[PDB]
Amino acid sequence: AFHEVRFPANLSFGSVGGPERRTEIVTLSSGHEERNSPWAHSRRHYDAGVGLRSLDDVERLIAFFEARGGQLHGFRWKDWAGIVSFNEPPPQGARVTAGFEFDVPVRFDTDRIAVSVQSFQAGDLPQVPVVEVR
Amino acid sequence: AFHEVRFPANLSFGSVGGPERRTEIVTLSSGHEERNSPWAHSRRHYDAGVGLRSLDDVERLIAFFEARGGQLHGFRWKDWAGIVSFNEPPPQGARVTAGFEFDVPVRFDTDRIAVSVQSFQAGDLPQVPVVEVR
Amino acid sequence: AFHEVRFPANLSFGSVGGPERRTEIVTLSSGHEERNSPWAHSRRHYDAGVGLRSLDDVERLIAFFEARGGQLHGFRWKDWAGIVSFNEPPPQGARVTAGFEFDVPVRFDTDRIAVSVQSFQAGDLPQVPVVEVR
Amino acid sequence: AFHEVRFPANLSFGSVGGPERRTEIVTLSSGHEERNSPWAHSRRHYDAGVGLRSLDDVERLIAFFEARGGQLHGFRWKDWAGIVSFNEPPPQGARVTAGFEFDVPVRFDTDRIAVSVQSFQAGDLPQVPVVEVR
Amino acid sequence: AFHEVRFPANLSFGSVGGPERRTEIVTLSSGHEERNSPWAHSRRHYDAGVGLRSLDDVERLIAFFEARGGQLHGFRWKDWAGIVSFNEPPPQGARVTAGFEFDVPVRFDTDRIAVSVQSFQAGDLPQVPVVEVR
Amino acid sequence: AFHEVRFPANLSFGSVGGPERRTEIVTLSSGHEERNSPWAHSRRHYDAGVGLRSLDDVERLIAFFEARGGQLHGFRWKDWAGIVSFNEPPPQGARVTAGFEFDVPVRFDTDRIAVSVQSFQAGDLPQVPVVEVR
Amino acid sequence: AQNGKDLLIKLDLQFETIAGLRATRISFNAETVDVTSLESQGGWRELLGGAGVRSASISGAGVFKDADTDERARQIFFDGEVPEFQVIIPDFGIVQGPFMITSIDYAGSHNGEASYELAMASAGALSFTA
Amino acid sequence: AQNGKDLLIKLDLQFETIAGLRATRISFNAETVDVTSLESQGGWRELLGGAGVRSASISGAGVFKDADTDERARQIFFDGEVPEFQVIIPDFGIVQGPFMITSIDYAGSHNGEASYELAMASAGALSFTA
Amino acid sequence: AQNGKDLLIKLDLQFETIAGLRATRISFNAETVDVTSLESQGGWRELLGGAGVRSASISGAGVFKDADTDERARQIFFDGEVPEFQVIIPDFGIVQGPFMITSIDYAGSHNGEASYELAMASAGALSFTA
Amino acid sequence: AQNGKDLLIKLDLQFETIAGLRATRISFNAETVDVTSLESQGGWRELLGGAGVRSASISGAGVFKDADTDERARQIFFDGEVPEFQVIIPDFGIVQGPFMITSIDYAGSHNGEASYELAMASAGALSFTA
Amino acid sequence: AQNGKDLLIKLDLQFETIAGLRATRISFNAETVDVTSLESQGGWRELLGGAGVRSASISGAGVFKDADTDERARQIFFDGEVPEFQVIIPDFGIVQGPFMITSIDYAGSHNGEASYELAMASAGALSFTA
Amino acid sequence: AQNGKDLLIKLDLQFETIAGLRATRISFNAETVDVTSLESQGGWRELLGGAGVRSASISGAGVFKDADTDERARQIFFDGEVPEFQVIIPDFGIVQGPFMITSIDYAGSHNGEASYELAMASAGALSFTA
Incomplete structure (x- = not known):
């Protein structure tokens, strides 16, 4: 775990991510069902x-x-x-x-990244999904 | 379970959802069928x-x-x-x-949501399905 | 089983459906093969x-x-x-x-239907597959 | 088995079909192969x-x-x-x-066919595959 | 095995094919890995x-x-x-x-081919993959 | 292993590739995580x-x-x-x-490559992935 | 010969023509449902005919003169309706169809008129009074 | 030289030309079924020819003069048919084909005519009387 | 008849018209929500009407004369807002809608004017003062 | 300088030019097979050249005068062939290529000519007699 | 009124206008980020405004007179840069933005000028000197 | 000012201009590689510049006068090459680039010239002699 830098400034339009909840669930075949979560927080889980x-x-x-x-x-x-x-x-x-x-x-x-060259100077990489580990 | 608010007012054109049933079914292979319904109700099951x-x-x-x-x-x-x-x-x-x-x-x-940025101030998220637990 | 009504009058262009035959089949790996059906009718099997x-x-x-x-x-x-x-x-x-x-x-x-809202008054649902049970 | 008629005259551009063989094959992994044919004939196998x-x-x-x-x-x-x-x-x-x-x-x-309505009088069905059983 | 003819002259733009190597491989989870091939040739493996x-x-x-x-x-x-x-x-x-x-x-x-009719005189078939067996 | 040449000079816009890691991970379900890295290096893993x-x-x-x-x-x-x-x-x-x-x-x-003909003199092949074995 | 002053589009409120009606044009359509089977005596394209959907579109141009029939079209646009519209052909007769008010536009220049185009399209089954 | 007054489109009811026939244009087509094999003596595009579907389209303009042949086209449009149509070429001869009535439109201005375009397209195998 | 000098677009700062207003054109739209069921009395296209979204677009041309209302539009563009805009129709009345400043452009030649187009589009619910 | 009366398209039956030949235009093409590698001395687009397919298209306009060569083109269209066509360039020489008869159209007005366009496209390898 | 001779585009090397500047046109844009929720007081389209990206494009026409500022644009094109460009509006003031040199073209005829178009587009944040 | 008679395209065989050179137009391009990050000081579009590919296209019109340089272009088209082409700008200088012969076309009418267009496009890295 570091405190090194934010990131490169650039982020394309489409940088998606929202909180992810364990939400262990039973799904009773009768009807209504109960549920509980053990986090009391939410992994923010930013992607793209x-x-x-x-x-x-x-x-x-x-x-x-x-x-x-x-x-x-x-x-x-x-x-x-x-x-x-x-x-x-x-x-x-x-x-x-x-x-x-x-x-x-x-x-x-x-496990790997994938940077592409689109022109003499263009550098692109399509996705870097994160999950904000504590 | 709350009684907190309806929702944010905005809903895009395409907010789909309609009632469900389990109604398991045997399809008697040499003639007609016979089928059972244990609900007497319907989960409204709104999506998108x-x-x-x-x-x-x-x-x-x-x-x-x-x-x-x-x-x-x-x-x-x-x-x-x-x-x-x-x-x-x-x-x-x-x-x-x-x-x-x-x-x-x-x-x-x-388990998670996924909000996207479409422009300097545009906020989008593609789907939030629901099932109307009692 | 009811005798209630036909349906709402509207049906979009693309309401597909045609008879479905059990057609139990053996597919001999030699060549030609025999087959028989136990219906003596055909489920009309309308969709969409x-x-x-x-x-x-x-x-x-x-x-x-x-x-x-x-x-x-x-x-x-x-x-x-x-x-x-x-x-x-x-x-x-x-x-x-x-x-x-x-x-x-x-x-x-x-098991469920899925009605969508496409504009202030537009109501759409994409499919209701039937099979004409006797 | 009948001798009833050819077919309706109309056939769209794309009525594909060509002969088959089983001709099972071993692909000897360190050299060439050897392969057997039990047919002496071919199923013409017309589709679409x-x-x-x-x-x-x-x-x-x-x-x-x-x-x-x-x-x-x-x-x-x-x-x-x-x-x-x-x-x-x-x-x-x-x-x-x-x-x-x-x-x-x-x-x-x-097992079934699927005829569609494309306009007030248009009738379409996308595929009827055949295999020419003897 | 014959010496009969080359082929019909026509071949569309897209007739793909290149040598195929057994390349039995171990993929050690540590890192670098060894490999060997038993051919000392290459099946040319022409397709399309x-x-x-x-x-x-x-x-x-x-x-x-x-x-x-x-x-x-x-x-x-x-x-x-x-x-x-x-x-x-x-x-x-x-x-x-x-x-x-x-x-x-x-x-x-x-096992089969699939020739299509695209107009009064047009004959098409999309693919005939080969592998050049010795 | 050779030291023979770089490559043909031409590379299309889209030659993607970036470093890898195994870094297996347990994701402790009720809190944060702990994760191990056995590499100290990275496979550069160039593709396309x-x-x-x-x-x-x-x-x-x-x-x-x-x-x-x-x-x-x-x-x-x-x-x-x-x-x-x-x-x-x-x-x-x-x-x-x-x-x-x-x-x-x-x-x-x-295991194989796939070179295509696009016109009388055009030669194309869509992908040649590499991983940089030591 | 027939006078172009004779063919008139008109709104309901009972039917009255709009004020500025400089150029108007009813336009019918059919999408030509192609039924081209492989057999055809010279390879000609065969068509079905009656299976095709059929439409109508009215494009009325004119200068903005305030009338109750001109105010009606604004009310038809804001309170979006599909009322009956009627277009005379000089010696054929009227059409009397349900249309909508698809796109209207008011325009003005530093020297010219207050002008307007009024584009309509078919909304139902049409008629013909002969 | 041939007079443009000579080439005439005409409806059935027995064949009679329509009244306003200001400008008419039969237009044939073929979609050019490209058969470009890899071999070709200079890399030239090769074509098949007879495999292509072939069509015809008639675009008749004119001023609305009421005639029974003009009322016929309205009846052909509402009761959607594909009857026989016939177009003379001056010194070639007639065509005598089945067409449909794809899109007609009546137009009028505040000062001009009651005018109409009449667009047709091929519906079957055509002919030629020489 | 109504003078084209009368219909005026105007900005807020209280409303004042812009300086060069050579040609202006409010243009309304609706996308025509097609509801074509299989049944229809002649195979006609049926439309719903009120389900369609409805819009407005203003295209103002003019010559660049410096005014505070002309400087306002630059400030509306850089500080991107959607303020109230108001367009008179001569004998109808004003519109008074929220619009944005979608695309403006300044142009000049070696011999002519400093001219500008100003294109706007609807941003909210509109009105009508009668 | 070269007279436009000199360049002539001509059919086989032995070669004869068609009657109405008001405006004709042979048009060659190549699709420019882009071979843009990442390296290029200034980031310039590199092209291959000879890999591109190459074509020819003839668009002949004229007035319908009945000739056997004009009847021939109708026979070439109905009996869909790809025969030899030949186009002189004044001081270059002929082309002598196989073409097809892609789209022809006959047109006539209430006052003008019987006119026709004749559009052709390449069907094989071409030539040049110098 | 403002003279069209006053609005001037100018390059850096310190700013100087180009030689042939027959017609120039700065053009701004915004893509109108549609935010149409289901609720809207009359079914009107709602827009967000400030979320939209905003642009600028300069299209300069002129006759090729050799100047150092004209040679500069060639050097800006071959050595592809995005330097500062500046466009005066007569009584507004300058813009002073970073642009690129998107597409230039030199043209000449057998009788006319050496002429050129010069098309530019925005490359960064712009300004306004008032 | 510079004479339009001065800017000349010319082929190799050593360079000579073609005969009919009624109107010629070198046209450069760049595809404007959009690099729009989320951050941008006013939401402006940012561009990269030098990453874009850059091109050139020559469109020469003229009347067919037979010359060896005119026969050369036919030989360049049939034997598909990408040789060196050279275009003078009056007081700039030559370009001297490798181009191809993308599409040529010869045209003639019943009364006019044997005319031709000659369209070329860039095939390599260009130059500039100053």
Whole structure:
């Protein structure tokens, strides 16, 4: 786990991700059913990041996966979407922030990455799914 | 189970959903059939909701899943389609309404949600299925 | 089994359906093979009905599935395609009509339906497969 | 097995079909192969017929499947592609014709058919595969 | 195995095929891994031939599959791509030619073929995969 | 393993590839996780090369797979993206280069290749994946 | 010969023509349901005819003169209806069909008129009074 | 040279030309079934020819003068038929084909005519009387 | 008859028309939600009407004369807003709708004007003052 | 300079030009097989050249004067063939290629000619007599 | 009123206008991010506004007079850059944006000029000097 | 000012211009590789610039006068090559690029010229002699 950097600034339109709940469920064939969750939090589970810049940005991005990445390190993640609460219900969110200001430390959900060359200077990679491991 | 709110007002064109039955069936192979119904009711099973507004609407929508949601709470659902009966046959519907006026308490059929960014302020998420647990 | 009504009048272009034959078959790996059928009739097996009208037609259509439907009732079906025979071969069809004038009592091949809203008044549902149980 | 008629005249562009063989094969993994043929003949295996005419043609076509069809009868098939030999190699075809003049008696490869309505009078069905049982 | 003819002259743009190597492989989960091949040659493995001419060419093509074909005969194949060596590395190809001048005797990788009619005179068949058995 | 040449010069826009890891992972179901890495390195895993030139370039490319290829040889690979370190984090890459200057010796991830003809002189093949065996 | 002043589109409220009616054009259509079987005596395309859907479209141009029939079309557009519309052909007669008000547009320049186009399309079964 | 007044389209009821026949245009087509094999002596595109479907389309313009042949086309459109149509070429001769009545349209302005276009397309095998 | 000088688009800052307003054109639309069931008395296309979304689009042309209302549109474009816009019809009245500033463009030649087009589209529910 | 009266298309029956030959235009094509590798000295698009298929298309306009060569083209269309066609270039020479008769059309108005367009396209390998 | 001679595009090398500047046209855009929820007070289309991307495009026409600013654009095209470009509006002021040199073209005839079009598009955030 | 008679396209055989050169137009292009990240100071579209492929296209019109350079282009088309082509800009200088001969066409009328268009496109890296 690191505190190294946010990320390269660029993120394409389509960087999807929202909280994932265990939601162990019984599905009684009669009808209504009960359920419970053991988290009391929610893995934010961000996906579909895309780096799009020149090839000068690519070599600092492919080794972003490699050098401080490996697989098992933090690289605090910037959300385009210290305790934050959500008060729009009479219930509450009350979800903690270990890092400051929406920085949600994560890890990539990939054994490999796949960077493409689309023109003399264009560097693209289609997806880097994360899950914000605590 | 809550009585908290209907929903965010916005729903895209394509919010599909209709009642279910188990009604298991044997299909007697050399003639007609015979089939049983254990319900006497129907799960309304609404699907394919889409939130589409500014990013100001998104943070009150992602924590709609989280704060009063969790997994196991009501959030009474608004139908764009106290006992209501259906008299267009000589049979009857006679289906109850625990909540008032087509409000059909439900739960989301998701372990996670997936909100996308479509432009500087566009917030989209493709689907939030529900089944109306009693 | 009912004698309640035909259906809502509207059916979209694409309402497919044709007779289904058991046709138990042996498929000898040598070559030619024999076969026999135990029906002496043919399940007509109509599919892909679509309701398309205003939302005033929808509430008499969603409870068509529910009220006289459930799963296990007749609702005599209108074919856009008392004993009828087919004399275009020197063989014969000689297939009976329990109901009058092509009315073929059926049941929907669905545990649930899925009605969509496509605009302020547009009501759509993509398919209601039947099989004309005797 | 019948000798009833060829077919409705109409066949759409795309009525595909060509001869088969079992010819099981071992593919000796360290060199060439050796392979056996038990047929001395070929199933012509015509597929993808399409009826496209008015609805007046449809009722003589849906009961073509039903009346003289059932499952287990001939209905001699017309090829748009008494013993015929093929002499373009120094080998020979020498394939028999039980019926006269390319008439290849078959059977439909379907438990059901599926006729569609495309407009007020348009009748379509996408496929009727056959295999030419002896 | 024959020496009968090359083929019909016509081949559509897209007639794909390249050498296929056994390449038995171990894939050690540590890292680097060893491998060996028992061929010392390469099956050329040509695919995706298409006949496109008039229907006069079709009856000499459907029985090309049948008469000298069956399944298990040569029909020397023409490549649009006596020992040939490849000297562009300091290694060598040194791959033999049993037939003269790129004629690569093969067999079709099909139990059946499928010829289509696309217009009054158009004859098409989408694929005839071969593998050049020795 | 060879030191023979880089490759044919041509590579189409879309030659994708990025480093891998095994990094097996347990995802402790009631909290955070713990995960192990046995590599200390990364397989660069380049994919989706495309040769596109005249047919004069094809015969030096199909035997590139064959002559110095076989299956089990090097053919040092050119990256459009002696020890190189990556210093943009306070961590380090420190990944070795056995070959000089980004030359990453590999092997093709294929039992066969598939070269296509697109026009009188166009030669195409859609993919040649590699993994850079040590 | 027939005068172009004679052919008139007209709204319901009882039927009255609109004010600026500079150029109007009823246009019928059919989508030509192609039924091309493999057999055809010279390889000619065969068509079915009556299976095709059939339509009508009215494109009325004119200058904005305020009338109750001109205000009616705005009310037909905002309160979206499909009322009966009627178009005379000089010596044929009227059509008397249900149409909608698909797209209207008001335009004006620094020197010219307040002008408007009014585009309609068929909404039901039509008629013919002869 | 041949007079444009000579080439005439005409309906059945026995054949009579329509009244307003300001501009008419029979138009034939074939879709050019491309048979481009890899071999071709210079890389030229090869075509098959007779495999292509072939068509005909008639586009008649004119001014609405009421005639029984003009009323016939309305009856052909509403009662959707594919009757025999016949088009003379001056010194070639007639065509005498089955067509349909694909799209007609009546138009009128505040100052001009009652005018009409009449678009037809082939529906069967055609002929030629020489 | 109504003068084309009378129909005026105008911005908020309280409403004032823009300076160069050479040609302006409010244009309404509806997408015509086709509801074509298999039954229809002659095979005619049936339409629903009120289910269709409805729109408005304003295309204003003019010559660049510097005004505060002309500077306002630049400020509306850079600080992207959807404020209230208002378009008079001479004897109908105003529209008073929320629009956006979809695409503007300034143009100039070696001999002519500084000219500009200003294209707008509907952003909300509209009105009508009669 | 070369006279436009000199370049002549002509049919076989031995070659004779058609009667109405008001405007004719042979048009060659190649589809430009793009071979753009990642390397290129300035990022320029590289092309292969000879791999591209190459074509020819003839569009002949004219007035319908009845000739045997004009009747021949009708016979070439109905009995769909791909015979030899020949087009002179004034001081280059002939082309002498196999073409088909892709789309012809006869047209006539209430006041003008019997006119025709004749569109052809390449069907084989072409030539050049110099 | 404002002179069309006043609005000027200009390159960097410090800013100078290009030589042949016969007709120039800055054109802004926004893609109109449709946010049409099911609820809307009359079924009107609702739009978001500020979520839409916004652009600029410059299309400059002119006659090729050799200048260092004209040679600069060739150097900007071959050495592909996105430098600062600046366009005056007469009484608004400059724009001063980063653009690219998307497509230029030089043209000449047997009797006319050496002329050129110069098409540019936005490459970054723009400005406004008032 | 520069004479349009000065800019000249010319073939190799050593370079000579073609005979009929009525109107010629070199046209450059770049496909504008859009790199629009989510961040951008006003939501403006960002572009990369040098990553885009760049092209050139020559469209030469003229009247068919027989010359060896005109016969050369036919030989370049049939024997499909990509030789060096050279286009002068009056006071810039030549271009001297490899092009192909993408589509040529010869045309003639009953009264006019033997005319031809000659369309070319870039095939390699270009140059500039200043």
